[PDB]
């Protein structure tokens, strides 16, 4: 919930990875931290927010933070979701 971080410390933050289809999908600090404001007034906000919901199991919502570095395919004909590195 609007947690902020020190914008200076992204270079010492870890990658965070999600395992999907057995494959690791990593996010770098530059991807999972939301920048707000500009140049010098910039605020850095954590892209991870806490939410406890269950539907078959504990549920994650992979919003724009994830869908930016991963191009996403919604396959209705086969009922699949696909991810690849965005370019």
């Amino acid at each position: 919930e609007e947690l902020q971080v020190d914008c200076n410390t992204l270079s010492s933050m870890p990658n965070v990875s999600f395992t999907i289809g057995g494959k690791k999908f990593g996010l770098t600090p530059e991807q999972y931290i939301l920048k707000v404001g500009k140049g010098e007034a910039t605020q850095c906000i954590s892209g991870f927010t806490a939410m406890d919901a269950t539907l078959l199991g504990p549920l994650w919502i992979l919003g724009d933070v994830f869908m930016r570095p991963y191009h996403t395919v919604f396959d209705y004909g086969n009922l699949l979701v696909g991810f690849a590195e965005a370019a």
Binding site: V16, L34, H71
Partner: protein
Amino acid sequence: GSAVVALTNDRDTSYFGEIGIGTPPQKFTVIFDTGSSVLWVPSSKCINSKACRAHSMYESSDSSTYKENGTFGAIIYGTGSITGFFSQDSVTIGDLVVKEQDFIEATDEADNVFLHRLFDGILGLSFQTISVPVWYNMLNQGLVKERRFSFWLNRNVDEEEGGELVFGGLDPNHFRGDHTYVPVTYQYYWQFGIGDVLIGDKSTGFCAPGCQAFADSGTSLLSGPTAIVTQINHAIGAN
């Protein structure tokens, strides 16, 4: 793919593009949202709602292909709600014209949530609940070749596009490598199973036996189990 929609990136927290509703098409800015299943826009008949008055509205009497419905409709989002009634019209997206599309024209909208945003309404792309979604009508009408749609979301930059949604295909210019495909596990959201969540190489343990996730282009951040997110935010020093 049969239709490409250019997306605008607003501060990395929302992405939207244009649609037309009616004949001739009335223009709206909408979020294309894989997290929800209804299409709604503000109604010309909006009832004491400041959010509507600042946004583009739909006037059924201006459209020659409007067909009345009038069934009550309401949506309580992950913040607030919109309320109105169903109507039917043609929905134009890129160069596709989706006929007989039902949507809610909202006569009341939660000002706190919708009043000061750059979009007018929301186009749901998740699985059907109370009304046939735009995507299903697309398929039904043969308007797309492939039964797939895809999103490229760009970072918030100035010389570049905000993003691109493709109905009925892919843009290979916006990915590298093959897509990893996983099956939908619960057909409501576009939900699938996931495994462990790691901080560097450290397991956060809680989702190690297996969790669920859905891809939500209409949501800004990542939301997940407190038991894991607490660990991540601690690790990055958020507070």
